[model samples]
Target: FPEEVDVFTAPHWRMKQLVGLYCDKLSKTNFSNNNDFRALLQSLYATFKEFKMHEQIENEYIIGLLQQRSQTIYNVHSDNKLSEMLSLFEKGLKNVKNEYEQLNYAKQLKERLEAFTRDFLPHMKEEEEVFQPMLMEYFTYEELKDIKKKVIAQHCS
Candidate 1:
């Protein structure tokens, strides 16, 4: 099988990519009041600092939409899984919370990054492979893109 997520594009990887982009800039630039975007657990952290937007991404995108509707998408690294898969879905929240708390201390930076990769890469794949398709079940591709634009407007510029 091919190793790509087919044609559906996920916001998850883009978030990771933006975080990575800012991360690369951290070591290279000296913008005034320059903050390290890598210091954030949340991908929207820079925008959040600038405009207080992450709350919407968390509540609206992650909690309200993704986990709220998908009974079938919960099958990975979560904790309360009487149905292992269920916990995996919920684990996304926990992992984020852990990262949110620990973003304060980059004490074991490299150590923690791999943990995030292990947990999040799979979640990203799940969203693209499974969840995105589930969403298409409800909205047309155009509708989804419009929804994405709305989501972007709500979260940032």
Candidate 2:
């Protein structure tokens, strides 16, 4: 496969990197500061929201093509649970009965987010290992190049 315009591998790698960066930042964060905590949560939420958006684009352009060519079912990951977990952090922080509860509340969010990232990393692997081959097999290099152009113009740009 042509290295540069090949879509799935690079983007999947980038997602893992970005998630790790955010995970590190979350680890270092001082949860006691209400401003810092909420800000990080908001940023993290928006990051994954964009991730979900990117997933939609891939569904339409990439996976959509694969399904048309083959009978195999695709197992895409869902962001709903991650969104809910982040929301719960906001909710828990808001509804804490006392200051003492904040530690455990923030702790839970960090743990869940970490666990979710752990689960998600392998999902990208599946896409790269399984879906990319199918894409390679079904589409011409020229066609894949065209799809990459559309994906970048519509998404990465």
Q: In terms of lDDT, which candidate is strongest?
A: 2
Q: In the order shown, what is each candidate's alpha-carbon RMSD?
A: 10.5, 2.6
- Candidate 2: segments with Cα more than 4 A from true spot: 72-82, 89-98
Give the TM-scores of the predictions, in the order they appear.
Answer: 0.44, 0.81
lDDT of 1 at 99: 40
Tell me, by TM-score, which candidate is best.
2
Model 1 per-residue lDDT tens digits across residues 122-141: 65566566656766665566
Model 1 steric clash pairs: 74-85, 75-85, 76-88, 77-88, 78-87, 78-88
Instruction: Report model 1's TM-score to 2 decimal places.
Output: 0.44
